[PDB]
């Protein structure tokens, strides 16, 4: 049995990974209960390569609503929460699957106090994103390019701007007229990308994070039947406004390392016969 | 036997970095107005190596408090806030300088409402952390190891635990009795470490983030002159309790790909 | 000197042994060949003949891939592969007048056409990660001499004819995906039959029994 001997340079390489989502900004709520040197491997080969591909991103917001105890006139919380989405699109080469996960940070928190009766209407917190705040849309894919995002030297994304608009939400009061929250738009402009790896005991779970800056644009948002009026932003009541997905489309270039299929180490005479 | 690559090899290398802090969970407040393919570089030569060294993490929390206009009985927030620390220590006959940043996530917020009269005490949000929360501590150093953390394969850390207890905050009411918040303590055990890089335009900016998991302990914490029930956790009023620094000790092993 | 010489139709199929090492699913040990038997019925000369054929290999080459000592990393210590050096041996037993009078022969020979054998695809099952595969591989068999031999099956000894076959390697390449290995040449021992039940060879054999 001939034995093919191993060559001088080591065959070290990438480490097992599972692509997934990143961390999130979260916060619960508690309501009251009453009302009133060593070397581990030898040398190895690696080359720097460029991967420039188109990226299509589809995202969707999500919202959570929590009403307090009592007669039911007043709400405790109306806020944002992460949302996920998946789809298939077509690079000029092939069809590719995609997942995404939206989230926010630096959010502003507004409140309104109609009165101190059981009947009166109060909302203790409704959120709104604005200039200072940001939006992070994480991403992972099945194509070949995403298999070599580990060990990245540089990464830059050219992306288009998008506009998100506010829908409308109706406060179902037991008795009397129904006030309503309506409108509010913010526009996303791209900012830098962020990569991240969490070293748990046996898998390097990893993720990207496309940051996105915000600017404020008309229409305004308003709460009807109240004194709060004509303020800018995107309330959390109905951000999607009846659309299944908002989209961003553009290019991304990465410069990374790659295991070198150097082509020299080969069993001599590896060829067709002659 | 097998063929061998013999030509002169090229020089790819690490990319410029600046070590710093990561992102942070933040949220402002608005108060009412009234009151009522191509190869870029050629084949190169790399190697895999161990860097295993000790570590002393020193940190300290920080709180924010804000009142609401009016008679002065209504607070609107007693919350947490990231904090920084700069220190020096010795490790195997070497003085290392270091910077550390402490933030907290997963907060559980509370509330009290003594009534609606202008005079009644009210605190709309005082936040604690109680087994559903994590404290994330970020650390950077001046040693050689941290220079080669770029392109890491596996990092692990065996670190000792540290108990953090609360102090006391004596709320100031214009007239009458002063109530006070007192108590609480948690134990910070270790969990997975995180490494995160930000490819901004100028230069990459990276961040390490040790992540710790809390577990509640005694003593219990309480708010005087009310009905709040001897709850458990660490109140954000005076978290460091007159101590300049909390500290943790340990060892960390990383396995990194360094240029040869 | 009673003479027997007949048309003949061989059929056969390789077989492999895979043995992984313990826990975490990463580090295999052996991916090797082993003999294999096939039984069939065909018609020749307007008669129906049953047959039993056993295929074995010798002169095999041993390759290896070592991704590192660290646990999580992929390792396969020995996967065999065939090339121009190696020889194939296929043996054949029939049920007819001839192979009753195949002991005490004076001359054996045979003319046989050729065949191609191609690899398939084996999917290593890693618990976490992307599944590296092993694909490709081709080879072509060209005839050689004939000899007497005996194959033992089901506790009944049997007398048969052993054909030898020399090899010539040909394209496609064989490659391990998700690694630096690529563009190697030969027939690996992962999935040689490629789902195909039987490769078949045909020809004629000449025999002068005594």
């Amino acid at each position, epitope marked *: 049995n001939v034995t093919i001997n191993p060559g001088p340079f080591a065959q070290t390489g990438y480490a097992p990974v599972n692509w997934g989502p990143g961390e999130i900004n979260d916060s619960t709520t508690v309501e009251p209960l009453l009302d009133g040197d*060593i070397v581990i491997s030898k040398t190895s080969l690696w080359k720097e390569m460029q991967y420039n591909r188109d990226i299509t991103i589809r995202f969707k917001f999500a919202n959570t609503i929590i009403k307090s105890g009592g007669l039911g006139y007043k709400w405790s919380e109306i806020s944002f929460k992460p949302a996920n989405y998946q789809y298939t699109y077509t690079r000029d080469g092939e069809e590719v699957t995609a997942h995404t996960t939206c989230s926010v940070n630096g959010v502003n928190d507004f409140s309104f106090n109609g009165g101190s009766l059981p009947t009166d209407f109060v909302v203790s917190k409704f959120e709104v994103i604005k200039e200072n705040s940001y939006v992070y849309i994480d991403y992972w894919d099945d194509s070949q390019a995403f298999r070599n995002v580990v060990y990245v030297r540089s990464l830059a994304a050219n992306l288009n701007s998008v506009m998100c608009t506010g829908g409308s939400y109706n406060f179902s009061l037991p008795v009397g007229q129904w006030p309503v929250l309506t409108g509010g738009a913010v526009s996303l402009h791209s900012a830098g990308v962020t990569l991240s790896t969490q070293f748990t005991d046996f898998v390097s779970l990893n993720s990207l994070r496309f940051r996105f800056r915000l600017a404020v644009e008309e229409p305004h948002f308003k709460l009807t039947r109240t004194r709060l009026s004509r303020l800018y932003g995107l309330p959390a009541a109905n951000p999607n406004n009846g659309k299944e997905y908002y989209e961003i489309a553009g290019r991304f270039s990465l410069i990374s390392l790659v295991p070198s299929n150097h082509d020299y180490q080969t069993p001599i005479a590896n060829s067709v016969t002659v | 036997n097998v063929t061998i690559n013999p030509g002169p090899f090229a020089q790819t290398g690490y990319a410029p970095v600046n070590w710093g802090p990561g992102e942070i969970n933040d949220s402002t407040t608005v108060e009412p107005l009234l009151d009522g393919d191509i190869v870029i570089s050629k084949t190169s030569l790399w190697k895999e190596m161990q860097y295993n060294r000790d570590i002393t993490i020193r940190f300290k929390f920080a709180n924010t408090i804000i009142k609401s206009g009016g008679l002065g009985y209504k607070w609107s927030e007693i919350s947490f806030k990231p904090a920084n620390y700069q220190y020096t220590y010795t490790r195997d006959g070497e003085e290392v300088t270091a910077h550390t940043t402490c933030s907290v996530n997963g907060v559980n917020d509370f509330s009290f409402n003594g009534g609606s009269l202008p005079t009644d005490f009210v605190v709309s949000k005082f936040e604690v952390i109680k087994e559903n929360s994590y404290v994330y501590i970020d650390y950077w150093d001046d040693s050689q190891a941290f220079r080669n953390v770029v392109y890491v394969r596996s990092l692990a850390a065996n*670190l*000792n*635990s540290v108990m953090c207890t609360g102090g006391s905050y004596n709320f100031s009411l214009p007239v009458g009795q002063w109530p006070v918040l007192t108590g609480g303590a948690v134990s910070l055990h270790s969990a997975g470490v995180t490494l995160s890089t930000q490819f901004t335009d100028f230069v990459s900016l990276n961040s390490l983030r040790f992540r710790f998991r809390l577990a509640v302990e005694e003593p219990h914490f309480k708010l005087t002159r009310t009905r709040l029930s001897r709850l458990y956790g660490l109140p954000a009023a005076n978290p460091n309790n007159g101590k300049e620094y909390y500290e943790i*000790a340990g060892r960390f*092993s990383l*396995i990194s790909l360094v240029p040869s | 000197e009673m003479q027997y010489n007949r048309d003949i139709t061989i059929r056969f199929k390789f077989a492999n042994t895979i043995i992984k090492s313990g826990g*975490l699913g990463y580090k295999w040990s052996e991916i090797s060949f082993k003999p294999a038997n096939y039984q069939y019925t065909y018609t020749r000369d307007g008669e129906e003949v049953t047959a039993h054929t056993t295929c074995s290999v010798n002169g095999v080459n041993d390759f290896s891939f070592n991704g590192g000592s660290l*646990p999580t990393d992929f390792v396969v210590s020995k996967f065999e592969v065939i090339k121009e050096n190696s020889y194939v041996y296929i043996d054949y037993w029939d049920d007819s007048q001839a192979f009753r009078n195949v002991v005490y022969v004076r001359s054996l020979a045979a003319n046989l056409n050729s065949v191609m054998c191609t690899g398939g695809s084996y999917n290593f099952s890693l618990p976490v990660g992307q599944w590296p595969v092993l694909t490709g591989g081709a080879v072509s068999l060209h005839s050689a001499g004939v000899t007497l031999s005996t194959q033992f099956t089901d506790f009944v000894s049997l007398n048969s004819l052993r054909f030898r076959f020399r090899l010539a390697v040909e394209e496609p390449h064989f490659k391990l995906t998700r690694t630096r290995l690529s563009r190697l040449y030969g027939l690996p021992a992962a999935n040689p039959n490629n789902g195909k039940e039987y490769y078949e060879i045909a020809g004629r054999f000449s025999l002068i029994s005594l």
Partner: antibody
Amino acid sequence: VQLKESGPGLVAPSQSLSITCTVSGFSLSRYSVHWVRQPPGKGLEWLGMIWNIGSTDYNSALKSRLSISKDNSQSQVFLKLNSLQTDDAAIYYCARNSGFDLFDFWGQGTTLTV
Amino acid sequence: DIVMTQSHKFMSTSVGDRVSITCKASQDVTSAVAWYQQKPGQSPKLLISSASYRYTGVPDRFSGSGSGTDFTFTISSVQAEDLAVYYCQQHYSTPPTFGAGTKLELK
């Protein structure tokens, strides 16, 4: 959890040495192991440690003389010491780590004769 | 490296009387000191993991204290199976370093 050792017991100077600690109940991809020894009638000592990740750390003095190794396939760990002395005679223990350097569960311990 | 010492190698107490042990350190190990117990024909066991915290299931009659350099280990009432050696470890540095080993004898 159960930690068991296995070793020769009698050895000659200027030779090698190999001990094997076989673990069960806990995975060596979730914990680390330590080796310690007890000079007869003298304070106990630290020899070496093997981590969760595969990396190893040694005592300064016997750094030159020992090697620590493991195999998740045999769910076992092993140590080798070479060019020993008469002074190296002692009882040897393999232990688990929980925090920084806290030892939690210990083995029975083999004694050595040189 | 780190260096530790224990005061005596024998301490004598009848069933029911306070035992008290001390071990000093060569530097200010901040609250990182442990205590192990080794009975005859037994493998050591972990009792007081941090200077004061008791690990897992250990009786209550054990406890510890100390801060800075000086550290102590105290039993309130003695029993018949407590006659064993006790070691004090130090875990704030690379070489974990035990003490000499002080034990008890009965009167």
